[PDB]
Structure formats: C-alpha cells, structure tokens
Design a protein around this ligand. Sequence first.
Ligand SMILES: *[C@@H]1O[C@H](CO)[C@@H](O[C@@H]2O[C@H](CO)[C@@H](O)[C@H](O)[C@H]2NC(C)=O)[C@H](O)[C@H]1NC(C)=O
Ligand SMILES: *[C@@H]1O[C@H](CO)[C@@H](O[C@@H]2O[C@H](CO)[C@@H](O)[C@H](O)[C@H]2NC(C)=O)[C@H](O)[C@H]1NC(C)=O
Ligand SMILES: *[C@@H]1O[C@H](CO)[C@@H](O)[C@H](O)[C@H]1NC(C)=O
Ligand SMILES: *[C@@H]1O[C@H](CO)[C@@H](O)[C@H](O)[C@H]1NC(C)=O
Ligand SMILES: *[C@@H]1O[C@H](CO)[C@@H](O)[C@H](O)[C@H]1NC(C)=O
Ligand SMILES: *[C@@H]1O[C@H](CO)[C@@H](O)[C@H](O)[C@H]1NC(C)=O
Ligand SMILES: *[C@@H]1O[C@H](CO)[C@@H](O)[C@H](O)[C@H]1NC(C)=O
Ligand SMILES: *[C@@H]1O[C@H](CO)[C@@H](O)[C@H](O)[C@H]1NC(C)=O
Ligand SMILES: *[C@@H]1O[C@H](CO)[C@@H](O)[C@H](O)[C@H]1NC(C)=O
Lengths: 256, 162, 314, 223
Amino acid sequence: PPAYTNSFTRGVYYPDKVFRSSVLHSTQDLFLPFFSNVTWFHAIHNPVLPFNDGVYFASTEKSNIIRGWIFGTTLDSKTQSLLIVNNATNVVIKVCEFQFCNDPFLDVYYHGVYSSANNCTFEYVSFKNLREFVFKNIDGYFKIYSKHTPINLVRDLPQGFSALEPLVDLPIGINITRFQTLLAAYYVGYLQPRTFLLKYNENGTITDAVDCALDPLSETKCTLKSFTVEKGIYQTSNFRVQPTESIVRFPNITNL
Amino acid sequence: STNLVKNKCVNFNFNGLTGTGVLTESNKKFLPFQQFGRDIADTTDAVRDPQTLEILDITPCSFGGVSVITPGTNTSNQVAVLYQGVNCTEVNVFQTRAGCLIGAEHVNNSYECDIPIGAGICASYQTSQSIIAYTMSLGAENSVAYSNNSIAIPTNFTISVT
Amino acid sequence: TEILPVSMTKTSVDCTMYICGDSTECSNLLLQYGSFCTQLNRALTGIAVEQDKNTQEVFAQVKQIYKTPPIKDFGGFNFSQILPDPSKPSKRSFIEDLLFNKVTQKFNGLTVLPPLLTDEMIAQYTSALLAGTITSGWTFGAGAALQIPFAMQMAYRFNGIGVTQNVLYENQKLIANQFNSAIGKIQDSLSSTASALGKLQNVVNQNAQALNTLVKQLSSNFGAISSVLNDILSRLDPPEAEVQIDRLITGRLQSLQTYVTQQLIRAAEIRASANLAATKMSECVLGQSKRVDFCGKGYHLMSFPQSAPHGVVF
Amino acid sequence: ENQKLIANQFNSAIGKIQDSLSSTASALGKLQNVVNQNAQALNTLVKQLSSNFGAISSVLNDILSRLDPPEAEVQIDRLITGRLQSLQTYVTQQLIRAAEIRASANLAATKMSECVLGQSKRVDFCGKGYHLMSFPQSAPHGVVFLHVTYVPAQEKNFTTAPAICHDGKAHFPREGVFVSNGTHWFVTQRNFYEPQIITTDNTFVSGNCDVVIGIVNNTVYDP
Ligand SMILES: *[C@@H]1O[C@H](CO)[C@@H](O[C@@H]2O[C@H](CO)[C@@H](O)[C@H](O)[C@H]2NC(C)=O)[C@H](O)[C@H]1NC(C)=O
Ligand SMILES: *[C@@H]1O[C@H](CO)[C@@H](O[C@@H]2O[C@H](CO)[C@@H](O)[C@H](O)[C@H]2NC(C)=O)[C@H](O)[C@H]1NC(C)=O
Ligand SMILES: *[C@@H]1O[C@H](CO)[C@@H](O)[C@H](O)[C@H]1NC(C)=O
Ligand SMILES: *[C@@H]1O[C@H](CO)[C@@H](O)[C@H](O)[C@H]1NC(C)=O
Ligand SMILES: *[C@@H]1O[C@H](CO)[C@@H](O)[C@H](O)[C@H]1NC(C)=O
Ligand SMILES: *[C@@H]1O[C@H](CO)[C@@H](O)[C@H](O)[C@H]1NC(C)=O
Ligand SMILES: *[C@@H]1O[C@H](CO)[C@@H](O)[C@H](O)[C@H]1NC(C)=O
Ligand SMILES: *[C@@H]1O[C@H](CO)[C@@H](O)[C@H](O)[C@H]1NC(C)=O
Ligand SMILES: *[C@@H]1O[C@H](CO)[C@@H](O)[C@H](O)[C@H]1NC(C)=O
C-alpha cells in the first residue's frame, strides 16, 4: 500500500552542458511532471518497476544502505544488466550476467551476492544528505544526475527548488524497458514528455522552473516565456471537440 | 449504415460526403432531386439522410481558442479560462456571448471594465476576493438635467499635464 | 451624410487549424516552418485588438454615458429620428435601424472574435455622445459635461464658422424646419438610394471578399495533386505525401500571409479612417471643426454620430 | 490672477510623471511595445536561420558535408527560398510598421508645429481638454510630449436667456452666454465663471424681442 505525496518542484536537471545567463530558455524533453504522485517504497518482508520514458530515483541514506541497481529488459541470463556498486567511495559499473534464484536479494536482515558471468561487455570504475539520481536513456546514452543538499527534515520533501547537475555518460546503447533496485525512506518517480520554462540566473544556475501544462497560469507563463505575468487576458492555445466515434451512412435493402 | 446522432459532434460519411461537425434538425425544404445543401462560400451546410428524407444541418464542432484571464502576480494568483465562442454544454461556469467562461461567477452589479473579455463582459479580481465576470458599465450612468433656460458654467478648473 | 469605416471584422484566423486539421503529416510538416504560423497569429491578434482601440478612440471619448431627459424642449429641432427609441428592444434609433437594414458561418478556419463593444454598447456610446452634443454641447469631451440649452449652443456654434449667433435667434423656426426636412431627405435617400452608404458597403464588401477568397484558397490546387489533405494522406505513400503536403503548406501559407498582409494594409487604411473619425468627433462632434471641407462641403455646424455596422455615420 | 496656483498644478503633474514612470509599467506602453515589436521582429528574423523551411537541416555546411552536391544544391535551393521569403515577409512588415511610424511621425510633427510651436485647436489631439502647450522629451525610437491642458472641475447651475430687451431692443452676448446667480444677471465665458455687468459694450442689438426664443426681460446698465 504505497503512500502518495506531492512532489512539489522536484525533477529539474540541466538538459545539456551549454551555458546560458539571465535567459528564460524553455525546453521540452522527458521530464518529471510537477505535482505528480510518487510511489514511496520501503523494505518490509523488491519488484520490477517500468522504465517508461524515464526513471526518477531519490533516497535518504544516512548509513549508505541503498547503493545498487539491476536494470534490464528480460534478465534471462542473456542480456547485460546494469550493476552499480558504491564501496569505499568508489563507483563501480559492470554489465555482467549471472543466474538468478527464486528470490534474488542481498544479505540485508537488519545489519553481496555475485556468481560467475556469461557475457560482459562494458567495464567502468570511478536526513543529513538527500541524494537524487534520475535515470534515463536518450540516444543510447544512460545518464545520471546527482545533487546532495544538506537539510534537516525526514517526514516529507521540502517545499523548494534545486537543480540536478550530471555526473557521467553511459553509452550502453541497449533498449531498456524495466528496472529493479536493490536495498530508510526512498522515492520513485516517472518522466513524461513535459515542457518547462527554465530560468537561469546571472551565474547560470537554475533558480526556478515552471511547468507548461500544469495550470492556466502555467500555460500563460510557458507561452509568454516569462515568470512575471502582468494583468490582462492572454490567448494561450486552441481546443478541439473530437468526434465521438464515426457516422457512416449508405442506402440499403432497396426493394428485395 | 449504423445509427445517426444529433447534437453531438461526430464524423459523418453521407453517400461519400465526408467531414466533421454536428448534425442538427433543420426546417429547410429540399427539392426531390436536390440531395445536399450548400452555402455562399461553397461550404456544406445541410445534408439529408438517404434513409429518411429529413433535413439535417451541419455546424462547426467547437473551434475557439483558450484564453486565460489572470490578474498580475503582483495582486493575485488565480486564473479564469475563457473558451472563445462555444456553448457551455461541451465545456463556476458562466456562459457569455463571447464564449464559455470558467472560474468566475457572474456579478449582477456593473462596474468599470478592467480586463475586457468580449461582447461587453469584463473581469476583475476585486469584489474573499475572487475573479468575477460581469456586464460592463462604461462610467457612472449620468443624466445631465437638460434645461429650457439653465446652464452649469464651471467656476474652477484644473490644469493637468498628460 | 458622411460615411466612414471605423472598425472591421475582427477575424483572428487560427493558422494551425486553418491549414492542418486532424492531420499528423501536415502538423509535422508545418512544425518545420515554425515562427511563420505563430507570427501570423500574433499579427492577427494585434489587428483584432486594434479595431477595439479604434472603437474606443472613436466612440468611447465620453467619460460617463449620459441620458437625454424624456422631455425634449429643443426649441424646434426634432431629434426623435436619431435619439434612441425605447420601444425597440435594442435602443437603436430609427435612422440607425435604417442603416443596419441597408447593410447586409465562421467555421472554415476563420473564427471571428465578437467585438468587445457589442452593437448595443456601440449604440449606447453613440447615444451618449449625441446626448452630450445636445445637452452638454461640446465640453463633455474637454472636461466634465456642462448643461447648456440647445439654442444657446448656437450662440457659439454659428460663431465657429464666422456667422453671427443672431441668425438662430432670428430664424430658428425655419432653421429647424430646414434641418428636419433635410434629415427626412436622408431618410428617403437611405430608403431608396443605396450609394449613400457607399463607403460602408465598400468596407464590408472588401471584408467579405477577403474572407471568401481566403476560404476558397482552401479549394485551390496550388500545384498539388488536389486540395484535400485527407485524400492525399489516404492515397499517397508517405514519400510523395510529404512532398505534396509541402506544396499545400507553401501555397496555403503564402495565401494566408498575403491575406494578412492585405489585411494589415487595409487595417492601416481603416486606422487612417478611424483616426479621421476620431478627429471628426473631437473637432467636429465634441466641438466644431474649422478645417474647411473636412466635415462636408460648406461651413460646418455640428455632427451627430450614428453607429452603423463596422463603421460610423456622421 | 492665479499664476502661482498654475505653477503648483504644473509642478504637481510633473511630480506625478515620475510616479507614472516608476510604479506603472504601461505608462510608456506605446514606445515600449514599438521597441519590442522591433526586438522580436529582428529576433524572429534570426530564428528563421534555424528554421528548416522544409530542408533537411538549417546548416548549409552540414548539408554539403552530408550529401553530394547534386542533391545538396536542391536542399540549399529550398532552404534559401525559405530564407528569402522570410526576409520578404520581414521587409513588408517593416514597411507597413514604418508606414504606421511615419503616420505617427507626421502626427508628432503636427503636434509640435501646432502645439509646441503653437496652440493646437484640434480637440483630443494634444490630450484630453483645452490644450495649452507641449514639451518634447525624446526617448529611444520615439518621443514624449507633456500635454499641458486645461480641464474644468467644479460647476454651478445658473439660468440663461439668449437676449435682453431693455428699451425694446434685443441684446445678445458677444462671447459667453448670459448667466444669473439668482438675483442679478451676468456674462461669463464658457470655461470659467467670471461675471460681467451686462452693458452695451458686450451686447449687440439684433431684431425685436418677440422673434427670440427664451429671451427674458432684464435691466441693462447705462455707462
Ligand atoms: C479652485 O480650486 C483651488 C484648489 O484646487 C483653490 O485653491 C485653494 O485656495 C485657497 C485660498 O483661496 C487655499 O487656502 C487652498 O489651500 C487652495 N487649495 C489647495 C489645494 O491648495 C482655489 O481657491 C479655487 N478657486 C476658486 C475661485 O474657488
Ligand atoms: C418628430 O418627428 C417624428 C417623425 O419621425 C414625429 O413622429 C410622427 O410624426 C408623424 C408625422 O405626421 C405622425 O403622423 C406620427 O403620429 C408621429 N408619431 C409616431 C409615428 O409615433 C414627431 O411627432 C415629431 N415631433 C415633433 C415635436 O416635431
Ligand atoms: C554569482 O557569483 C558571484 C561571485 O563573485 C556572487 O557575488 C553573486 O552573488 C552570484 N550571483 C548570484 C545571483 O548569486
Ligand atoms: C505592485 O507592487 C508594488 C510593490 O509593493 C505595490 O506597491 C503596488 O501597489 C502593486 N500594484 C498594485 C496595482 O497594487
Ligand atoms: C446551448 O445549447 C442549448 C441546448 O442544449 C440551447 O438551448 C442554448 O440556446 C445554447 N446556448 C446558446 C448561447 O445558444
Ligand atoms: C442646482 O443645484 C443645487 C445643488 O445640487 C440643487 O439643490 C438645485 O435644486 C439645482 N437646481 C436646478 C434648477 O437644478
Ligand atoms: C448675486 O450677485 C449680486 C452682486 O451684487 C448680489 O448682490 C446678490 O446678492 C447675489 N445673489 C445671489 C443669490 O447670489
Ligand atoms: C421655455 O422658456 C421660454 C422663455 O421665453 C418660455 O416661453 C417657454 O414656455 C418655456 N418652455 C418650457 C417647455 O418650459
Ligand atoms: C417684457 O417687458 C415688456 C415691456 O415693454 C412687456 O411688454 C413684456 O410683456 C415683458 N415680457 C415678459 C416675458 O416679461
């Protein structure tokens, strides 16, 4: 029975490394919609969640328990699987394949597992803190964005804004439609083709970003490419009334 | 041949005549050899059902844009969507001549226009206070007492600099 | 009876639905052009607001809508032809009704925005302006209105054109009869002669051919295989369908750009006429114009605006 | 008689000018939107360099590097036709906008000739009311006028009559209708109450009494 809370203004990341100053450059790509339901998970008594267009992952690991991920589409000991290890402050990524048991899990009773491999293709090794890791695959590149902000609150997400700068580029090139994490409050979101109106400050830091199709004022701001909308009436867009199903008529029966 | 539905926007294919619109009962008589109607702009207007010789109009579905009547963020944060020139049936709600208006209640009182809407309707956030939409009254309705032999000549004045 | 356009059909063509309606290929091909369709919309919305601005600059030159007292002791002048009749559900006077009778949809792609000032509001502004002209004279546009008898209005209004004020006070009966017979002659002319409102049927006509020509551009081949996007999509394989829809988008966007360019030229023309009408009300209605041959041949006394569809009548 | 008060109103309105500029973002609406119109006109002119216009891309170098010249030539042909059409649209819009700007420029020249270099008699041309003078204050891509006008505020209801028959001879006012305060009758101009003693100097005889409508009997002082 997952609980659903408000995401506030979370899920905004620098789409590209181009630097912009004091400009409200709008953009559209796979984004986490504003004010969307978040499926809060916990470790009581580990399913596969859809990758969808994008994956948003956030966690609060004071003792660093959540450090691993297993991604893939079939996981039939034939496809390579994302495997992330953060041990001794070292980021380890490998895509080896190993056989799975009835209930594959990591030894985590109350405070790893890895057999031999079949096909390995890519090798790479590098409360108080809230760590955010969006996951997406664009043009065959797996991208991770990170942001650690020191706050003092655990009950829910803060009512503020913060950007998500990137760390690494992962050119796997393999289609991904499923994923599954491995293990104390962590959230999961989903990215959708939304559109924002970013706001870069003098130094190029995103101070605030607003969705386009959230509310009528959001659409007005998205159209005007501005945050301060003065008085008046603004033509935003059009609207259609779609046909119900169809109407096809022809002569029939006639005489006999 | 299926069924035929009135007063609900839907596609139609009458004897090869395709298109989109809403079919409405009409009182336009057709000659027996005349099948479908027309307008001045070479646009289909009335079509008769081949099964039953009943004259049916053809009307735009909704068209109209989506206006957004909002006061400045200096004052408020609430919205008021106006759907231009559509009946308030397909789409609190106060139907106007200019269109189907959402988010503002009609005010039986008439004040000065602040944010013009259309066809005389005007909106404002002040009267808690919320966005309204009323019939505009251009200035206080005055009635100067026109007289047989009386005048009102000013005794003082002002000198503005516009 | 000078005839002047003031506003026009505030058409605001939505370019997206005008060209590509329920057509994924047309949408994806028009997306390439980008700012053309948006700029057409912006220009047309600017036109739409600017007929409104013309309308306030012409009629809404009065602070407060005045009302003529039911008793009308004008000293001889019969104004019942142009002062509004309460009998009609819409308080447009008899001559204005003649105007609207003289002058004789919105579903292709060309949804017309209704005027902010509806016909009743236009008539109410004209009634207020004319009631100010009678009761307040001219000061209602140069400060607060000032009660003044109509015959004492001539104490300065003849003086405007160098004719001494005593002409009224010695010839008022015959002047009133002449004005009433004249306005009856305008009544008969509008009843029988259709060329009196020539400029207003001109403006509404060229608007009608503008709209009709634009909508029949939809039926023009423009060098494609046809002018039916649905038929093109159904028949052609996408490699040729994209090219033919490109031909259609080039042709139809050129037609719409030409339409809005002629509409901008005509809107500057109607802006010239609307500033002309604003100047003729301010100088000529809300005062007494000294410009010779400006408010009609001969020395000019006053003017009475009479709202007409998509224009004004002096 | 009230020059100091005139100065007070003038300086008060000048003081209100700073408030209008500061507190209101639409005080300079016309000039601001003209500078804007130009700004996004040039801006969209720039963006059509990014628009594909039906070409494979908006980079001529990319087109030439990607495909052979036999088809690249056609690609830049279509792209350059699109760019030329965009520039034609911009120049036609610029011509119409400059025609509007020329109308406003001749209007400003007329207001400066009749209104700065004179006192314009065209109502509602140099502001709302009886105009006095103007001051040009240039702003980029425009000009600003300070239309000093005259506007009556306070009124008082009096009694009128076109003529006066003292010795059986009518008497009409040269300028300014006849008014009375209730007991005695006076003459004053239209736009400022200032009474005169009704004498033969401000009146001219024209016709008899029974021909005038609204005439009242009255007493005329004999100088
Ligand atoms: C016209 O109105 C002005 C105010 O707008 C009057 O000016 C006042 O004059 C008196 C002295 O007569 C001063 O005590 C007041 O302070 C003035 N007003 C202000 C706001 O300073 C002027 O007197 C009026 N003129 C007439 C003839 O009534
Ligand atoms: C002002 O003129 C109007 C005509 O527009 C007069 O109203 C009608 O005049 C005709 C002319 O004989 C009469 O037969 C009607 O009985 C009048 N009333 C109607 C039609 O309702 C009006 O009487 C004139 N008023 C003055 C004071 O001259
Ligand atoms: C940008 O950095 C400089 C560092 O010198 C700082 O002074 C300034 O406040 C920063 N800008 C913002 C908007 O914080
Ligand atoms: C706009 O904001 C300023 C800032 O305090 C305020 O003084 C002003 O009154 C606001 N505008 C209106 C119309 O209230
Ligand atoms: C809206 O539709 C109803 C019928 O459903 C009709 O009676 C009404 O007149 C329509 N509204 C307008 C403004 O025509
Ligand atoms: C003149 O104005 C006063 C004050 O409003 C009023 O009492 C009086 O009745 C008015 N007289 C006329 C003739 O309107
Ligand atoms: C009108 O003015 C005269 C000036 O001498 C004065 O005697 C008289 O009392 C005044 N009457 C009224 C009603 O103000
Ligand atoms: C208007 O005033 C004149 C003054 O001579 C008078 O003869 C006439 O009867 C008056 N009419 C009305 C309707 O008061
Ligand atoms: C005006 O005075 C004359 C005196 O010569 C008199 O015959 C006439 O009836 C008077 N009229 C009025 C309206 O008092």
